[PDB]
Amino acid sequence: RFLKVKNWETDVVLTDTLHLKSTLETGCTEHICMGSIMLPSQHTRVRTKDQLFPLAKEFLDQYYSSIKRFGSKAHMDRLEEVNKEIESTSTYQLKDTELIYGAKHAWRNASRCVGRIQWSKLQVFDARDCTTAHGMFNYICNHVKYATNKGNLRSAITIFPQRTDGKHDFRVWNSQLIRYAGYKQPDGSTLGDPANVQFTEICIQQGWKAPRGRFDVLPLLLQANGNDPELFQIPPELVLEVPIRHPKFDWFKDLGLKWYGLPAVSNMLLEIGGLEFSACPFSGWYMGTEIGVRDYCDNSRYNILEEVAKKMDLDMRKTSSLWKDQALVEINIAVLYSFQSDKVTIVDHHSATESFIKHMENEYRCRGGCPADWVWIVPPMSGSITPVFHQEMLNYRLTPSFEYQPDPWNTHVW
Amino acid sequence: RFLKVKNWETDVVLTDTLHLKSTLETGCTEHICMGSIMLPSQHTRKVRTKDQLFPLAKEFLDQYYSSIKRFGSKAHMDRLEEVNKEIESTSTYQLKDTELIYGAKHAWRNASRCVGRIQWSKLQVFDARDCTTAHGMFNYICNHVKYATNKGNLRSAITIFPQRTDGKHDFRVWNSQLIRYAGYKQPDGSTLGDPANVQFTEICIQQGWKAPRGRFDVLPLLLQANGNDPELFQIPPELVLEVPIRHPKFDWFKDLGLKWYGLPAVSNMLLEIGGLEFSACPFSGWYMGTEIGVRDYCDNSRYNILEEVAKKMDLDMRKTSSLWKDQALVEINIAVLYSFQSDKVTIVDHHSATESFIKHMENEYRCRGGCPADWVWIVPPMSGSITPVFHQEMLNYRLTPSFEYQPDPWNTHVWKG
Ligand code: HEM
Ligand code: HEM
Ligand SMILES: Cc1cc(N)nc(CCc2c(F)c(F)cc(CCCN(C)C)c2F)c1
Ligand SMILES: Cc1cc(N)nc(CCc2c(F)c(F)cc(CCCN(C)C)c2F)c1
Ligand SMILES: C[C@H](O)[C@H](O)[C@H]1CNc2nc(N)[nH]c(=O)c2N1
Ligand SMILES: C[C@H](O)[C@H](O)[C@H]1CNc2nc(N)[nH]c(=O)c2N1
Ligand SMILES: [Zn+2]
């Protein structure tokens, strides 16, 4: 019950005590492991008055422990003050310090995130005074500019007002702040990003004038206080993009590939002390494989493998020539090369997983553990030559947390 | 209760009812997932009385007679009756030949970490339950190797030695695989040969094996019959099919001196059928290319040839973001596949193998109500997401008959002397 994880490449063994603090459920049982389910019910997300105070107490307890004020007057006073506020208002407000700690720890606890060694350097933008979609746009432009930083990317989260009665939710309808559009052709194929075909249609259905290109930056669709969402175009000078070329193949630039520099997830829900922040876009920097392996080479995405292997003149007759694997490596060399050339922050999967092993070491030593989801942590190429492949990981759910939530168009009372 | 799994590349959704027939435990709880634990308590086998044995037998026989469309028949009830009296009077029981064949096929069919299970029904089962000595084991294993190898046209096979009785007369193959290369720790700390096999190599040498001390020395068989001290046997070299590894474009690749054997034959697992434990049950199939090209050759703790291969390719080795490791890895795996195909030795690449597993899995859901699958093990160790299993949700649960791990015998064996 005080669990051991072993690294089978190095024989390092770590003892996990942190999982005993786990609160939420995994979706597994003794009879069945659901470790490969993408979205179990638990990972998705009104709070009654009774559920809220224990959630607040557990959070304030760990907060005051983290500042070595556990059991202090200031601790008990804050517990009482929040306890009174919940009794009266049926909710409560976080102190700035508690909001910042909560957001950093939601990242720290994100068991699927390989980049968590950076978790404590997150820049938290308090947007809880926001009231309109235009204000949300302003907060998001400031986030994008701060985080992009002329290509020296910086981690950031912007936190909009917390859920109240569920009818006044703040929501960013986009899945990411910056994402390329997707159009169904009459021809039957897909232009641009197929993953965003439905969202691209909701944008057009709301007024957007699509250039119908291959890499059209989507507008923001912002919902404040539960109102109808509104379109806003992000200033192009704020959207850093990188043309993709290859350091050896001159024909690579002719493929016309580019990608955006800033990965900014915008559709998740931040849970702190029972409070639910339905609009909390956060951003870091890319691991190369997200673009090169998933975005460019997933069959349900840009799906460029065949085209690249063609230009490489690879034997595509048989799968055992591993033409897909060759092409895959070259595409991913090009992504890393392009970002590094344009001085846009990016990390290769080798450095990132090595960092995560170091991070796990640190968390086990200083925290007693590190929830980690192997299915997600292991990169989607060259898995076993990265150290995380050989790392046993314990997956459990700690709070504060980032959770998934239903897409807004399914829920929005129009 | 029904459970759904989704393929996120095709949106195909399958419904699992088979997990309801699951008896054993996973290691996970509502509060922790142990999905990535390599050798969890539940997948191993350290010792079993007449108390729990008849329901295990009854459950198996019910499954068996259902599969042959004889559930509730007179043959079914008489067999249950017969097994029951044999248990209470002798404390164990013997499987019929048909039941053993069924049991071994279904143990493979239930192996949730095995990507090659489309083949499960075409398993050649060799009954070695009349074996009594290590020499008899050697003879059975030789015949298995020769049959399974079939001059490179590999055929799946399993050889099943007598079941455990009191845990003091076990049959065991001390080798982890029937064919495997020696590993030698040198005084300077480096390893010659396969570092994974250093401990077993040292046992063989202690038992009298004259080691050639090369990089690819086929290990001797260390065979334990009836709980006696194990004995050394050399597999006839004419029975050990090997492939020199060359590359279709890089002529310097052959000069690395690499080869591998053609027949992957796991020999240290435990086969559980109807509560009976078969502690010596070597089984063999054919290789997926990445087992050799990725894991055997490129694991840092194995042959670890990435450095020298990338040196000879003249890749940028100063920074990892050149992906020199990924580039060399692909070329090594091309070479492995090219060499086996050129020598007409059966092998499957990870694209073909994972595509077949998806078809197998969908078929199993339709005809069986499910297919237990361990994503962590099914996804190949390179190019994971450009194979279709990466995108496939999988439910992992334990069905019997099963293959289980057991502790290495040198840690449990009571030495006779
Ligand atoms: C700073 C550089 C970062 C890197 C290199 C990184 C890396 C990654 C990668 C590769 C994934 C898998 C994503 C996918 O395959 O779709 C992921 C997931 C995730 N990241 Fe990080 N990330 C970074 C920053 C952040 C930040 C700043 C946050 C939050 C403040 C965060 C929260 C998450 C969460 C919650 C997930 C998993 C979503 C889920 O549960 O399904 N990441 N990360
Ligand atoms: C016919 C071709 C076969 C292929 C291509 C194949 C492929 C594989 C691969 C790649 C693995 C992962 C192994 C590793 O990474 O160490 C595996 C695991 C496994 N295979 Fe198969 N296999 C085949 C035949 C068989 C047969 C004949 C049996 C038994 C009769 C079998 C039983 C298993 C079991 C029990 C495991 C899991 C070991 C564990 O639980 O840790 N396989 N297979
Ligand atoms: C901050 C950051 C850093 C980084 N390197 N990458 C990203 C984008 C990758 C990414 C997430 F991080 C995330 F939390 C959620 C998703 C959606 C998953 C949808 N999928 C289940 C179908 C996602 F795509 C963000
Ligand atoms: C029949 C067959 C077909 C095929 N293609 N490959 C193989 C070898 C791979 C393999 C198994 F299949 C298996 F069941 C067990 C192990 C031991 C795992 C040790 N691990 C905990 C460190 C193993 F290595 C065998
Ligand atoms: C079905 C499976 O869980 C799904 O394809 C997962 C696999 N692992 C992943 N890992 C990461 N990092 N990102 C993903 O989207 C996925 N997809
Ligand atoms: C720690 C982790 O479970 C371990 O490295 C696993 C990962 N997946 C694997 N998958 C296969 N096929 N074979 C393995 O040996 C492993 N090792
Ligand atoms: Zn699990």
UniProtKB/Swiss-Prot annotation, chain B:
GO terms for biological process: arginine catabolic process; behavioral response to cocaine; calcium ion transport; cellular response to epinephrine stimulus; cellular response to growth factor stimulus; cellular response to mechanical stimulus; establishment of localization in cell; establishment of protein localization. The keyword DNA damage does not apply. Changing Y287H: 50% decrease of nitric-oxide synthase activity. It comes from the Eukaryota. The PDZ domain participates in protein-protein interaction, and is responsible for targeting nNos to synaptic membranes. Mediates interaction with VAC14. Belongs to the NOS family. Produces nitric oxide (NO) which is a messenger molecule with diverse functions throughout the body. In the brain and peripheral nervous system, NO displays many properties of a neurotransmitter. Inhibitory transmitter for non-adrenergic and non-cholinergic nerves in the colorectum. Probably has nitrosylase activity and mediates cysteine S-nitrosylation of cytoplasmic target proteins such SRR. Inhibitory transmitter for non-adrenergic and non-cholinergic nerves in the colorectum. Homodimer. Interacts with DLG4 (via N-terminal tandem pair of PDZ domains); the interaction possibly being prevented by the association between NOS1 and CAPON. Forms a ternary complex with CAPON and RASD1. Forms a ternary complex with CAPON and SYN1. Interacts with ZDHHC23. Interacts with NOSIP; which may impair its synaptic location. Interacts with HTR4. Interacts with SLC6A4. Interacts with VAC14. This is Nitric oxide synthase 1. It comes from Rattus norvegicus. The gene is Nos1.
